[PDB]
Symmetry: C5
Subunit: 311 residues, 5 copies
């Protein structure tokens, strides 16, 4: 089999559609997600045309091997998609209706800057390479683009599944490629992060601030250091959940800034003790009394500034 | 091969049955489980009919390629099922009896709200897409739906395996699709969670309450902070075991509430020390004495409340 | 190809044999193990009979596709076995000698009650489904059942590999099934658990009991809490190694009971301090002196009871 | 099919090109990366030559099985590449133009000496084995070597993708082989390591130095020991991120040297206490006062020497 | 196709050779390694013989399906090798020269007794089973056994790749099996273990010994218990790197023995405090003074004994 010939010099229009059946495995570290969907292809092959009155059959059904099917591939897949042809139907005028069910691991980058209050636009790129005989061009049949209502992605809210109707036609290795952009819009469900990471992290910090109502250096040292470790435990836990970035993330900024607070609290605790030993507890008392107000305020204002910069 | 033609205008009824041989790999985080079962299919194809007298056989055995077999797929599978045809039998009246043994990774959401005292309904959705020639509809042959007695799912009690007899018929890309719902009812074996997570977590909490019978700030600080840390160790362990959720879980609520108890115990320990230093140990004594009763009671009442809200 | 015909009304006897080449990957959490073995099959197909005079050769060699082969499957495999036909030999009378080399992940439950002093019986179930023409029945050729001397399973002692000679014939989905039980007997190598988990865990426990020869509440609180924490560290480690169970395990019982010891040691340490503060160190001295003897004994006695209940 | 025959005694020149579509999964521990690219091959096969006049076609398309294709393999792949033929075009002189899309896991060693400030040269080796008929030699068509602009590798900056134009021709198992070296130049994005590992690690060390402004042995012991533990937590985190090497890495050297600082700080803390107990706090005061300056300087100096040796 | 017939009653000699292209993924816990190599097979088939002068062609090239190839398998592979035939060449005399490129996961046990100063002998066993017609016997063509210079195995030094020239001929399931032993000799690169595990572990132990120059029970309890904890962290870390063994390993012995040192240090710290409280600090002073010398010596002597027993 060879491609359908052009009537006039026109490129072949392959109408495409992706219908999500399942979405799963959004790997933050790998910046990948798995998808199970219908891929619909539609193109006119005049060689396949027939008479409905005399043939008595409105639609003719073919096996993939029997006819010419355009070689459609995904740009951003890890391995080539696992596909199973559902149906091939030919209308009397020779319009072909291809339908396959596929599953693929899609590689699409994520912006972690606003984590865990981030939204993402996942991409699925369809592509066709033009043949020497004729040029192939992709189009979106919006009728055949959608998703099942039950499509869920654990820890995410699925906003929309749409296609950018205008293909990106360009030359690659002295031939035309026609690229389509399917978009899955999702927003992270930040709920869990509040009682699991954010609040426990704030409690340990506040516990270290009780050192401002204590004169016991040994006690204070213990408070600050111990709380500090725990901060370390949470900080590390996050790095694991997260992917390394060449930029700062929201949570990353909060976590880093909290380290400075522990460092300064240690300084205060050290200073207060030094003065007490040097028999000048009145200076020490002033610093400790200032610290009781300053820390919460600065910590609080600093957070405000950060949230402003990030949102 | 093409589908059996309709006598009158009727849709084709494909009788289905799933018999579980093996159940395994219930991944809580992935919300998936693996299954190994028999899939039985039965439909009438008049073109295949014969006379037992003329033929000298009361049954006819075909190879998949030889006859028309309905394209049955699973909706909620990760990848398309691994299937091996066991047998295809034809009765003299053109009644086809298809049997395959398959294995598949089924994606079915879980409700973690009552963890680890939760029960789940796992779903296996069978589907058939109608062809241009005729409409296909699924039915349940309850005689061919079951499970082996030895079917086990590690850390779960297998309640039942049943099918919702009435299919969910609907349009998808202008073709009728017949969807069937097979249900595997399971309930979690919470036993382990008592000596592994629940009791150790209560012991560390109770140990922090011994600070209410001590005047040593340094000793008290150590008691609360250390225990808090251990609680942190346990709190983190759970999140690894359990998926991030946009709702609170039972264990999650208990764990979060316990953080508040440590926070308040630190406040009490701080308050008691402050008064002792300000040469007013009679006030301190009252608060500490109140704390000894108040803590256990409030803790206990709060759990009662939570259990009420969750069950 | 169809099944061979009966010469009287008899069922077809398929003689089986499994010879283990390799056993590996015993996953305790998954309750699975991987196996690499020879599967030998023998049945008689009179339709394949030949005169060595005419054919030239005393034994004929066929390709699987060329002749009828009984559909033998494994019941308890995760996915269908990876098999490669080593040889298919036919003797003049039509006796077929089938040899394949396969590899499979077998799902077989484990009893953790006596961990790490447990022994297991791993099962490999062979099965055949009878056809409408004739009934198929499995048999064990004990001459072809065995294992290589070099067969090892990391962290386990391989006791025996035997077959239960009598098949389990039963009806399933209105057809007969002939099931065979191959057994791999193994016992855990508990050696490692002594210097890795058991002894370090006892040392930390005994370190806490040194609080019985101290009057320093602050030092005691450190000893008991710190050591307690370490126990926690070990406790979790086990849980990672082990599977959640609906029953208590030996190690699990020891670990849980040790928590009670820390809890009571904290009580003693609290009690002793309270009395010392209430200016009654003679009562405190009696309790501490009793504790020095009571603890080891009770701990010791308790272990005895536990070992008795478990073995 | 057999190889094209030599006109004169010349070896067959196969022109090659690799165009990266996707690069992902750079595993530091495994020293591997996954790639998805176009592989282009071009050679002259006179047997396939045709006259455009009598044929009426400027090009001819063939199925892989129909013609002779040189057996090109990758040297450094884990498993043989997953390839799909995109197009095979024959020009009138019999110049074959082959194009496949492949995906492969490439094994290429990494130099960790400058981690996380290291750059790497990833290699992809193309190879062809010469046949008994004629010698096969590889060449680079620089017009067909490149990468998509959107090619990204998480946590790395992609510098260049080039080919060493001159093949490495040599003998292997008594046949000549033509080897080509494709190079992917990348440099690590060290950004993250600063707020995640480097800075937290410096803060904990500096906190240990507050012991130089304290006379409380118990507070100092706690300060150093605790901080030391945190370092330990960070040290372990790294060796998990980072592969074991037979050489020292930059971060590894910093981490190891920091251990010496804790060890010496413990000695100082011990010495200072010993003197204080021996009723000679003037000596102790001198050592502590020296330590306040010495540590930062030595630490600071030590780093310069290290950074110098490593860069 | 059937096997080549014997001229005289001789068994068929299949000359073998394995040439390592790549060696990777040495999994200590799994006791496996992955290999990518050339497998060469050479045997003589008189049915395939031809005339050089008459034919004009020195060598004839066949497709695997066209001729008889001996069924060579690997004994110790997890799954059957992924093989791709590179070339089949027939000499006039009928000597066939087969060459495939394969990749396989080899299961070969490891001796951890001297870890991390251990050397291993990895095995690759080639096997052939005889047919009813004639007996097949393997031989090593040392000219075709080797490895690429660039073959590396992360964290290991590759010593040699050799073959035991004489096969192990034996009967299994009433047929001859000819087994060959290919050996990959490797020695572990212990460098990393010194600054990563060994030295940090010694530093924490020396820090515990500073308790011998302190009279502060509270400080000593902290020193010994904390450091002890750190030791635990390292001990556990090692357990993750290593596999459970039925024997003691070198590192395992060092780690276990170090626990005894902490246990005895706690006893000393307890004893010293008890005497101080009983108003007898002169006895306490003697024990502490003895301990300072004794611990290093015994620690040092015991280590010597251990190294002697292990090497
Ligand atoms: C520790 C200190 C507190 C950190 C909390 C940060 C929350 C925040 O500030 O984030 C705000 C986000 C929503 O932002 P968005 O939907 O992306 O808006 C983007 C549109 N702009 C660019 C116009 C703004 O979260 C929430 O709605 C609820 C957060 C409750 C957190 C409770 C603690
Ligand atoms: C921390 C404090 C202890 C927490 C214990 C909570 C357990 C609970 O109270 O949960 C309740 C569940 C059972 O619920 P169900 O079978 O879903 O009942 C459904 C019927 N309704 C809807 C009417 C309620 O647990 C148990 O059967 C055994 C509890 C043993 C726990 C020992 C500790
Ligand atoms: C923590 C406290 C110590 C725990 C050690 C329990 C050992 C035990 O009691 O286990 C006993 C098991 C043997 O059991 P079996 O082979 O299944 O006997 C089955 C036959 N019956 C049913 C008649 C009993 O181990 C051993 O052979 C030696 C154990 C050495 C452990 C050293 C410490
Ligand atoms: C812990 C103590 C401080 C550690 C910082 C080491 C950084 C370094 O010194 O590393 C050097 C690298 C760049 O190296 P390069 O691009 O490979 O240069 C190779 C070319 N030569 C041969 C001419 C040298 O860092 C940076 O560009 C920015 C580092 C910011 C770190 C801030 C803290
Ligand atoms: C913790 C306490 C220190 C432990 C150090 C163990 C070293 C050892 O004792 O091991 C010795 C091994 C070599 O052994 P081999 O080559 O296998 O000898 C086989 C030949 N025979 C049979 C004759 C013995 O290491 C080394 O060459 C360098 C050791 C540097 C370690 C730095 C610390
Ligand atoms: Cl694709
Ligand atoms: Cl399916
Ligand atoms: Cl099977
Ligand atoms: Cl390849
Ligand atoms: Cl093999
Ligand atoms: Na302390």
């Amino acid at each position: 089999v060879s491609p359908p010939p052009p009537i006039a010099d026109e490129p072949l229009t392959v109408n495409t559609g992706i219908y999500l059946i399942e979405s799963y495995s959004l790997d933050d570290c790998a910046e990948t997600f798995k998808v199970n969907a219908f891929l619909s292809l539609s193109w006119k092959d005049r060689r396949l045309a027939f008479d409905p009155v005399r043939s008595g059959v409105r639609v003719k059904t073919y096996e993939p091997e029997a006819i010419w099917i355009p070689e459609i591939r995904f740009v951003n897949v890890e391995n080539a998609r696992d596909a199973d042809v559902v149906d091939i139907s030919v209308s009397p005028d020779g319009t072909v209706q291809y339908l396959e069910r596929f599953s693929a691991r899609v590689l699409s980058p994520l912006d972690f800057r606003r984590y865990p209050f981030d939204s993402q636009t996942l991409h699925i790129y369809l592509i066709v390479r033009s043949v020497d005989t004729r040029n192939i061009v992709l189009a979106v049949d919006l009728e055949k683009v959608g998703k099942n209502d039950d499509v869920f992605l654990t820890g995410w809210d699925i906003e929309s599944f749409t296609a950018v109707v205008k293909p990106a036609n360009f030359a690659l290795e002295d031939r035309l490629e026609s690229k389509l952009d399917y978009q899955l819009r999702i927003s992270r469900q930040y709920f869990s992060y509040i009682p699991n990471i954010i609040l426990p992290m704030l409690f340990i910090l506040f516990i270290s601030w009780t050192a401002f109502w204590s004169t016991s250096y040994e006690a204070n040292v213990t408070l600050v250091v111990s709380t500090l470790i725990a901060h370390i435990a949470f900080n590390i836990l996050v790095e694991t959940n997260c992917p390394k970035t060449p930029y700062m993330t929201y949570t990353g900024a909060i976590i880093f800034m909290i380290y400075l607070f522990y460092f300064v609290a240690v300084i205060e605790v050290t200073v207060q003790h030094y003065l007490k030993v040097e028999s000048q507890p009145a200076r020490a008392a002033s610093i400790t009394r200032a610290s009781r107000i300053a820390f919460p305020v600065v910590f609080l204002l600093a957070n405000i500034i950060l949230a402003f910069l990030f949102f």
